[PDB]
From Swiss-Prot, chain A:
Signal peptide feature range: none
Domain of life: Eukaryota
Residue sites binding ATP 1 per the record: Y163, G203, A205, K206, S207, N308
Source species: Saccharomyces cerevisiae (strain ATCC 204508 / S288c) (Baker's yeast)
Gene name in the database record: MCM7
Family per similarity comment: Belongs to the MCM family.
Functional description taken from the UniProt entry: Acts as a component of the MCM2-7 complex (MCM complex) which is the putative replicative helicase essential for 'once per cell cycle' DNA replication initiation and elongation in eukaryotic cells. Core component of CDC45-MCM-GINS (CMG) helicase, the molecular machine that unwinds template DNA during replication, and around which the replisome is built.
Miscellaneous remark of the record: Present with 166 molecules/cell in log phase SD medium.
Domain named MCM: residues: 150-332
Record's subcellular location: Cytoplasm; Nucleus
Disulfide bonds: none
Summary of subunit composition and partner proteins: Component of the MCM2-7 complex. The complex forms a toroidal hexameric ring with the proposed subunit order MCM2-MCM6-MCM4-MCM7-MCM3-MCM5; loaded onto DNA, forms a head-head double hexamer. Interacts with CSM1 and MCM10.
Protein name from the UniProt record: DNA replication licensing factor MCM7
From Swiss-Prot, chain C:
Subcellular location: Nucleus
Part of the intact protein present: 217 to 324 of 971
Role played: Acts as a component of the MCM2-7 complex (MCM complex) which is the putative replicative helicase essential for 'once per cell cycle' DNA replication initiation and elongation in eukaryotic cells. The active ATPase sites in the MCM2-7 ring are formed through the interaction surfaces of two neighboring subunits such that a critical structure of a conserved arginine finger motif is provided in trans relative to the ATP-binding site of the Walker A box of the adjacent subunit. The six ATPase active sites, however, are likely to contribute differentially to the complex helicase activity.
Domain of life the protein comes from: Eukaryota
Name used for this protein in its record: DNA replication licensing factor MCM3
Subunit structure: Component of the MCM2-7 complex. The complex forms a toroidal hexameric ring with the proposed subunit order MCM2-MCM6-MCM4-MCM7-MCM3-MCM5; loaded onto DNA, forms a head-head double hexamer. Interacts with CSM1.
Note: Present with 35100 molecules/cell in log phase SD medium.
UniProt similarity note: Belongs to the MCM family.
Swiss-Prot record, chain D:
Ligand binding (ATP 2): R11
Location of the protein in the cell: Cytoplasm; Nucleus
Function: Acts as a component of the MCM2-7 complex (MCM complex) which is the putative replicative helicase essential for 'once per cell cycle' DNA replication initiation and elongation in eukaryotic cells. Core component of CDC45-MCM-GINS (CMG) helicase, the molecular machine that unwinds template DNA during replication, and around which the replisome is built.
Organism: Saccharomyces cerevisiae (strain ATCC 204508 / S288c) (Baker's yeast)
Similarity section: Belongs to the MCM family.
Name of the protein in its database record: DNA replication licensing factor MCM7
Quaternary organization: Component of the MCM2-7 complex. The complex forms a toroidal hexameric ring with the proposed subunit order MCM2-MCM6-MCM4-MCM7-MCM3-MCM5; loaded onto DNA, forms a head-head double hexamer. Interacts with CSM1 and MCM10.
Miscellaneous notes: Present with 166 molecules/cell in log phase SD medium. Early fractionation of eukaryotic MCM proteins yielded a variety of dimeric, trimeric and tetrameric complexes with unclear biological significance. Specifically a MCM467 subcomplex is shown to have in vitro helicase activity which is inhibited by the MCM2 subunit. The MCM2-7 hexamer is the proposed physiological active complex.
Highest rank taxon of the organism: Eukaryota
From Swiss-Prot, chain E:
The keyword Nucleotidyltransferase is assigned to this record: no
Single GO term (MF): single-stranded DNA binding
Protein name in the entry: DNA replication licensing factor MCM6
Residues where ATP binds: G349, D350, P351, S352, T353, S354, K355, S356
GO biological process, one term: DNA replication initiation
Miscellaneous: Present with 13400 molecules/cell in log phase SD medium.
Subcellular location as annotated: Nucleus
Amino acid sequence: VEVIAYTCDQCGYEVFQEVNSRTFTPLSECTSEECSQNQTKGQLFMSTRASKFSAFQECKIQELSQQVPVGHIPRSLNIHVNGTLVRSLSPGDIVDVTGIFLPAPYTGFKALKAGLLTETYLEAQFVRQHKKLTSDVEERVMELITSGDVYNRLAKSIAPEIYGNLDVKKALLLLLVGGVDKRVGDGMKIRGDINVCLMGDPGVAKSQLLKAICKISPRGVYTTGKGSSGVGLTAAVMKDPVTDEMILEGGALVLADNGICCIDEFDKMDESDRTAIHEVMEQQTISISKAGINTTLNARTSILAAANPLYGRYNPRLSPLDNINLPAALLS
Amino acid sequence: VRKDPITKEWTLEGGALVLADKGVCLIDEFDKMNDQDRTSIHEAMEQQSISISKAGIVTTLQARCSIIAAANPNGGRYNSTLPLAQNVSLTEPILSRFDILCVVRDLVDEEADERLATFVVDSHVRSQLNARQRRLQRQRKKEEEISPIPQELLMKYIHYART
Amino acid sequence: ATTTLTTRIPTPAIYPTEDTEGNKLTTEYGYSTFIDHQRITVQEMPEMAPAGQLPRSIDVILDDDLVDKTKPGDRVNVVGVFKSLGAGGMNQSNSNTLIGFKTLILGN
Amino acid sequence: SKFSFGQATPRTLLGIIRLSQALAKLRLADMVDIDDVEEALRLVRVSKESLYQ
Amino acid sequence: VDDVTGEKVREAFEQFLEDFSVQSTDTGEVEKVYRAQIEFMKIYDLNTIYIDYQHLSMRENGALAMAISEQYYRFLPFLQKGLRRVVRKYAPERVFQISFFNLPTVHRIRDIRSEKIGSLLSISGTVTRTSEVRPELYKASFTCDMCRAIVDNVEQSFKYTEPTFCPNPSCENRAFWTLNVTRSRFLDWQKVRIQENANEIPTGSMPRTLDVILRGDSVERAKPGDRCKFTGVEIVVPDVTQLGLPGKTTEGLNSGVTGLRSLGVRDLTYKISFLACHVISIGSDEINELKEMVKDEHIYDKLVRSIAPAVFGHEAVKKGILLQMLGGVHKSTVEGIKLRGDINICVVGDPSTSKSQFLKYVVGFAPRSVYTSGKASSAAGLTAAVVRDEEGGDYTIEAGALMLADNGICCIDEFDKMDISDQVAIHEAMEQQTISIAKAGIHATLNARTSILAAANPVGGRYNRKLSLRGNLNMTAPIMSRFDLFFVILDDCNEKIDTELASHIVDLHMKRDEAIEPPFSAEQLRRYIKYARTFKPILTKEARSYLVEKYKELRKDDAQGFSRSSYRITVRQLESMIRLSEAIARANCVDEITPSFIAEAYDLLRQSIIRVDV
Amino acid sequence: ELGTSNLNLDARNLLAYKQTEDLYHQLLNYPQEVISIMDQTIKDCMVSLIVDNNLDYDLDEIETKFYKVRPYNVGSCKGMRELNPNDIDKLINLKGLVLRSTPVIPDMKVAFFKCNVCDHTMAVEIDRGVIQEPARCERIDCNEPNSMSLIHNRCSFADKQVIKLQETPDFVPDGQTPHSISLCVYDELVDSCRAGDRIEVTGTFRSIPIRANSRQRVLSLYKTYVDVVHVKKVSVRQITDQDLAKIREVAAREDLYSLLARSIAPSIYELEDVKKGILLQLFGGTNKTFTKGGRYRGDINILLCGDPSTSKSQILQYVHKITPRGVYTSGKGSSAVGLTAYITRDVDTKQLVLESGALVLSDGGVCCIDEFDKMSDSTRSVLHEVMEQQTISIAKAGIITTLNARSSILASANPIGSRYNPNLPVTENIDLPPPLLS
Amino acid sequence: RVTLQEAPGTVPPGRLPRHREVILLADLVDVSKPGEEVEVTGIYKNNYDGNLNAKNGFPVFATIIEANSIKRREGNTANEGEEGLDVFSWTEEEERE
């Protein structure tokens, strides 16, 4: 709010006032010039359409985690918006804001507590954001068409930072394009988007082999064993701040639809994960079967798994499936 | 130690023994739960007046309790000619806290059996101010078939035979 | 309660408006001065306190000149004035078993 | 039960059709033929028996 | 103008209790039932009425029955003022209520918004989470102690802590009040929540609910856990924001209009709730009929032939389950032991056979008898097991289909497949009729007198013949002797018995071929044993001397040696021997016990002990 | 000739008509007055057909109950990240998801008053945010400023319901969380917007103030909402007679044995023997229950086991397709206690709620259930009990109930080693209790 | 002030306990212990102003049992004129006997 308009439906004199801080008070009805000063006063109330309203949105900052000293943890800060720089920030924006400074009063429990604490914010002025199909880009599409070299130069293109293994770097690039399997028309929802799993225990830090592909491939979200486990792989309802609680906070698969689900640490949190892998290999049952709702959303994402062996090396002279614990998920 | 409510403290709530100063428990043969609690009752007699300090205060209450028990051998009473360590599943030290192992036995006896058998069937035959008094004399005579000093007075002198 | 020495009559106020005139008061914040405020609790050096107790603690209010100097886990050595504040016994009525004399150190 | 897995499911048969049109999608010269799927079985034989060394 | 309208409906109601409401004369149905409603009341003194919706509809043909749905929510004190007027003219501490029942239409809880305010709407549902019994006021005589505090004030509404109208003398009013406990009658109530039924829920869509206050004699009559119906007056409730310590959603958006009353500016919100008046839970010559039927002669054989059509043959098992169905004696010696209350009989046999039929038979036939499988042996149920702390209380008692077999014959099967811990637990539950628990909390002694009945499985499915049952029991030893005999069901692949059992079974699952005549019904057998239970037959004859020799002969048989079988049928089994014998005499309604009656008690165990012995 | 009060106007005609442009753009600019004008027209335009024939429902009763209109599908919107502050009184066309509901709280449409005179039944209107009161007596010529009381439970109230929405995450750029907005309905569109379905709402805009302190009238980041005029989902049968004539020729056909055998498999391989059981299970007899004795139901229970990957799920998915009311099992989303017998703490009142099991939930269908060689033995304990008495006995400290379950089942196992490994007794492969063999 | 739960003995089972309040008096302090079963011989006084805060404010009253006496765990409830009180006074006739 920036302006006000009270109408009393007797005189029609709309009393204006400046907007102060976040708490204010309406005035009386015997203050005007025409509808006042008699034995009858028009009783005031508000108006919506005659009251111009502005934009407002709140955000919090942290530190770059490279200029932090060796000691303490970084802390937050409060920022505001005005004018029309709104709807132009995002969670995860490595940005900077330029703006002006002012503190604010607290106006609540100011005697016993809240002596002369200040809890300032900064007020924004400018954002200088950073690090962001036949439309002036066709010159590089011709560079693959003229040079050709699909099966080998593109194989050396993705992940050239290993020793050997051109077979497996070729097995993945076909899955990074996918495509609609068949426009079925009738109610025959066919399987698409095959999933390849890996196994073995090299010492070449297998994690940054696969996950380096994921951080350059499109919409392919990283995950691990800790955190978004197989119960929090889908969406759920959780605690929120004092604003609208019981929102549908998600994990990975409700947001990484039709992309890459690059998983590691397959022996971790398997009581929820072993359900979680079948429910996406099964077509279209990513749901929240909780006591809140029984709504079901889509499932269209490929899976790239890397199971770690048992203790020491996987004994090749011994039997396989001594270290993966899911026979029914694998051989069929 | 029952836990606290919101503005409360970790207090101390007794169970069986600290109530029963002069009473009765039972340990026969809870075979699975034998190793759980037997390390808590054979230190009630040995380290007599036992209490403990889990996650709280280090105190020691007083409990001069009495134990009786009704243990049960694995099958029959003479499961062996072999001795008592072969018969019961208990070991020695917890067994050694007691005073006497009263044991029962009968194989075959004609006259002893009727001395139970004739005895037990007569018990099943034992199934207004004057009338409130007259029912009492009926209640007094029915215990007095041989008059073995009935329970109207017998328990009453026990309580000051102990105090 | 920051001048460290003189118990002046406090001003139970955040910001005044309308001085003795008909002018809407404006405030220049570039020429308004600020200062910071940080409390920290100090344990006992747990080798020279003899074995009859857990470590105790008190607290200290310092100022801007030596903030962010105190990483948690430093053998620190401070020196300041000893100081009580707060009303004990009158600010509430009947005041039974409530200390109203907080130990503070406004130091350097 | 010495080394190998699988007993030739049609679920493996439909998958080998899936990756073929995938490799026919990336290397589209409109040549869906015997040689295009010969690239496909070329990959299933080298992915399999990686344990035989 | 509505004042006489309520006065119009007052006498029009009154003449209905003056007129007849009875169509049939002296074919039953005595005329003028409402005067009998007065006269039954002046004996047992319960302070109710019970009026229907039919006869007031079919008196004015809906001229009044449509009016009364839209008056009584305002004119509560009109019908009740009228019945006070009619009782002085008829009868000579008096507080009443108005209880309608049986309106035609029954709604669900999702259909209550607009027309339903001040209406009368019967509502179904199921009930959960009751509360306790506290008193209400409805009228006080509190007043200020300014001059005289004896002003019986009015208006005991939802905020009634201020009697401040019309003081006695010219004194200081609303200066005080003194709610005495000595002159204002109270009425007792409880607040309960309801819930929607299981055969109507569209999806699992967080099934909504509401609350209801029941205030008359309706107190403690809704047992929690049944499909239940209600009276129907709907009501709104505020909170007045009294003098207590306090005064997501946009709730009370309606209530922002409700500001500016003469007391302080706030927001008085609302919520739809329910007031009831009357609960229900849907879900002679017959006394002479017993006196004829007790004077029959073959009714021992009539009963055993009329047990259940789901089995054919095997009269041995049929004789046992009848005696279990009735009760015996339980009264015993003075100052000490309570003896056995009953007999417990199991049956072993091959599964998927006629064993399941009795189990299906009794649980709908017996009074409140329950059925469990007992595989859930580690959480709770069979094993009585305390629940963890919830909502401010640790160590609370638990359920389990064992301590609720009060006047019930609980049934439970498959003894082989549980663990070893319960096998001593129910072993304690068998000898004396209590169980004890002192698990993580204080000791508990609950006396749940019981009557078990079992059906376990053999060790191979097929019963050995040359051996004994000591190997095929698949239990331990002392619980066998703690039990009676099992009457083992045998089988055969015989070419005649199959076809007759085929013809016996095909008429069963006929849509309608009810050609078999059991001589008794389900209910007229049920009241018959209810006549049978209320005696106490005592032996008086000299067959005690006849009793003691036969067991003394009996025990010398199964003791085959000093180192032979420990199925030594001891002094426990004399008790079941005599307490069967009073039970079978409780069938034929004889109070004395003959030596002829216990003869067939012996051969019941002679035929049992040969089924014991090889 | 039906009597209903609702006209679902497409409201995409004023741009397809040469006139009514200024009406059309006023509709998107003052949408509280213009519906109030248009509600006067339809009642009067109804009179414009009533004045033709004077034999049309007695010319009074269909002229007292008001009607209302419903403009919908007007224009288009795209989501929620476009809702600018200038959109104060406009139509908005949302596309999102309903989440949870509340029961109806009442509204203040009429008031009632009575002071302590003998009789005073005035009924003051409000139509505002302000109830106005008198301070003088009434119903006499000489009585003072008396205590006016507020007999609340006499004046009538209508319904109102608030419903929480969250937008469907449509082409969200893999970083943004779908946020929330609320609903407010007034008319009889209650109990039709059940929570859990896709939604497309057609509503106006409104914002309200909030009280900052809970006990003062002081107030200023406002909260808005929307007010629905018409909703749309988006996404005993009425038995006709041409169906019965069409099925009876089909019932006259000999080939229905094989015509129904071929029609269940639009893609599936042949396997005629399992087509008999699956078809006959859905054609599940009836409840031939006697009055005294018996209580036999004609329900059956088929199962399949053996070779993996024989479209085991899609066949079951095909059965779920042809049943309108059934249940789908989960991969370890249920257990011994996660089926029924609930003590769950809901986020609305923290009290008890007994939600039914999926087994009783399929009262009128076929329960589809799987992973039976991998189901735990703490559970796989109640399905025996529903296999005998068609019920669930709940052993909870909340309540006791032997509620029934009129439900039907099929089973779909899985092998252990690789296969059904023949020339072996195959029962030793699939481990299972020989009681439930019966 | 000892709050009291219903002892789960003579009770139609499968349900919850219920709560009351007991206010003892001067020479009746700490006679019982936390955990046994008891019985009281009180009166039934219902004094409160009418302020309650777990439920809303209503015309409702709460109960308070002011006790007058107390006895212990009783057993074998079958008597008719004796063993209802631990009388235990052995003075002229009993002690001579």
